Amino acid sequence: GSSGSSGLTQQSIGAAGSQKEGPEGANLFIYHLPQEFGDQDLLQMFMPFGNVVSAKVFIDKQTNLSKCFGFVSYDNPVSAQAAIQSMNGFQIGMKRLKVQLKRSKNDSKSGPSSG
Structure with a gap:
C-alpha cells in the first residue's frame, strides 16, 4: 500500500494548502487520516x-502534527459526491477513512422554473 508516482504532469492549479470552496452545497471533509498522508497526497488522492x-x-496545536483530517471541495455537489460514494469508508493501510461534505440545513438551489 501507500503507492505513489512522480509522473511529470502539466497540471498547475494551485490548490494544495487552500481554505477555498466550491458552490453552495458542494463540500468534502476527510477524517481519520494516517501520518504518512499530508497535504498534496489528499489532493492527488x-x-x-x-x-x-x-x-x-x-495541524494539531499541541503535537504540531496533522490533525488526521483535511478539507476539500469540488466545482459542484454532483462530482463531490462521486468521491464520498467510494472514499467513504476507504480502508487505507490498516484503518478506514471518513469523508463527508459539510452538512447543509437550508439549501436553495435555483433550478428550472416555469417548466
Whole structure:
C-alpha cells in the first residue's frame, strides 16, 4: 500500500494548502487520516475522482502534527459526491477513512422554473 508516482504532469492549479470552496452545497471533509498522508497526497488522492477545487490539511496545536483530517471541495455537489460514494469508508493501510461534505440545513438551489 501507500503507492505513489512522480509522473511529470502539466497540471498547475494551485490548490494544495487552500481554505477555498466550491458552490453552495458542494463540500468534502476527510477524517481519520494516517501520518504518512499530508497535504498534496489528499489532493492527488481525490484528483482521480475529478478536478478538486480545494484541498488542505489541518495541524494539531499541541503535537504540531496533522490533525488526521483535511478539507476539500469540488466545482459542484454532483462530482463531490462521486468521491464520498467510494472514499467513504476507504480502508487505507490498516484503518478506514471518513469523508463527508459539510452538512447543509437550508439549501436553495435555483433550478428550472416555469417548466
